[PDB]
Design an enzyme around this catalytic site. Sequence first.
Site, PDB file in Angstrom:
ATOM      1  N   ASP A 196      55.908   8.865  21.446  1.00 20.68           N
ATOM      2  CA  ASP A 196      56.367   7.585  21.954  1.00 20.68           C
ATOM      3  C   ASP A 196      56.536   6.559  20.820  1.00 20.68           C
ATOM      4  O   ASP A 196      55.622   5.872  20.407  1.00 20.68           O
ATOM      5  CB  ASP A 196      55.382   7.064  22.983  1.00 20.68           C
ATOM      6  CG  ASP A 196      55.837   5.889  23.823  1.00 20.68           C
ATOM      7  OD1 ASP A 196      56.856   5.267  23.414  1.00 20.68           O
ATOM      8  OD2 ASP A 196      55.168   5.602  24.863  1.00 20.68           O
ATOM      9  N   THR A 197      57.757   6.432  20.304  1.00 22.18           N
ATOM     10  CA  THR A 197      58.013   5.508  19.214  1.00 22.18           C
ATOM     11  C   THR A 197      57.899   4.044  19.623  1.00 22.18           C
ATOM     12  O   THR A 197      57.762   3.172  18.766  1.00 22.18           O
ATOM     13  CB  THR A 197      59.415   5.729  18.585  1.00 22.18           C
ATOM     14  OG1 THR A 197      60.428   5.616  19.586  1.00 22.18           O
ATOM     15  CG2 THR A 197      59.450   7.116  17.968  1.00 22.18           C
ATOM     16  N   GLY A 198      57.927   3.767  20.918  1.00 18.29           N
ATOM     17  CA  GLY A 198      57.730   2.439  21.446  1.00 18.29           C
ATOM     18  C   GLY A 198      56.281   2.046  21.679  1.00 18.29           C
ATOM     19  O   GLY A 198      56.015   0.935  22.149  1.00 18.29           O
TER      20      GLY A 198
END
Lengths: 99, 99
Positions: free
Chosen positions: A25-27
């Site tokens: 999850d890059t967010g």
Amino acid sequence: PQITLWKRPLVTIKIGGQLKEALLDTGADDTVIEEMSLPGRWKPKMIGGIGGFIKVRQYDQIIIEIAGHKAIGTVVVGPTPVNIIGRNLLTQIGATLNF
Amino acid sequence: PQITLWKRPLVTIKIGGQLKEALLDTGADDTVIEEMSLPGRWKPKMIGGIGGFIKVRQYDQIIIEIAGHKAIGTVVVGPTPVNIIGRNLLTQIGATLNF
Ligand SMILES: COc1ccc(S(=O)(=O)N(C[C@H]2CCC(=O)N2)C[C@@H](O)[C@H](Cc2ccccc2)NC(=O)O[C@@H]2C[C@@H]3CCO[C@@H]3C2)cc1
Ligand SMILES: [Cl-]
Ligand SMILES: [Cl-]
Ligand SMILES: [Cl-]
Ligand code: NA
Ligand code: NA
């Protein structure tokens, strides 16, 4: 690997000797794990997601394998739809976004 | 580009004639934009994450220029704390996670 995004980027992680599924999850700034037993002391943290702020338990210097890659770092434990691997550990495993 | 993950992967987007900053988010199924007007029909939806759910308006066939790359798809609009480019548009710009 090179992971495309047509499906959710789910991988196997290993924490505490247990295999679990987690979402890359890059967010996410932080790695957020469903309720489980971890060693040592924890400290409080508030994290703000899409629906509001929640309290989580912050455990530092936890050994975690992510898609076969070794990491040691902070995990926060609390109510999450799925285990999410955030940037603190994605940087340890050398992940980048590319287009 | 290759974007590392030491910092949030924020890019400039253009949507509805407006420039905005948004997060390239592999953990997001959908693209979620803060309150704005978009043309055409919409329908309500609930989306959920850490902290629970928010109500959004779903607009289909919306074009967004993402860091200079155009992509078309569904965009949901509502009280998100951050603009999010989710997988439905990341795929269209050929984004991958690499490690
Ligand atoms: C159906 O489409 C969507 C559903 C939910 C979301 S989400 O914003 O809730 N979220 C979903 C992730 C987390 C749960 C899951 O199954 N996938 C996207 C995340 O990337 C989200 C994106 C995000 C939402 C709100 C604020 C900032 C980022 N980040 C997030 O929750 O990170 C947590 C909260 C803390 C702030 C950032 O790092 C800390 C860890 C987006 C689109
Ligand atoms: Cl860490
Ligand atoms: Cl779409
Ligand atoms: Cl592809
Ligand atoms: Na415990
Ligand atoms: Na439309």
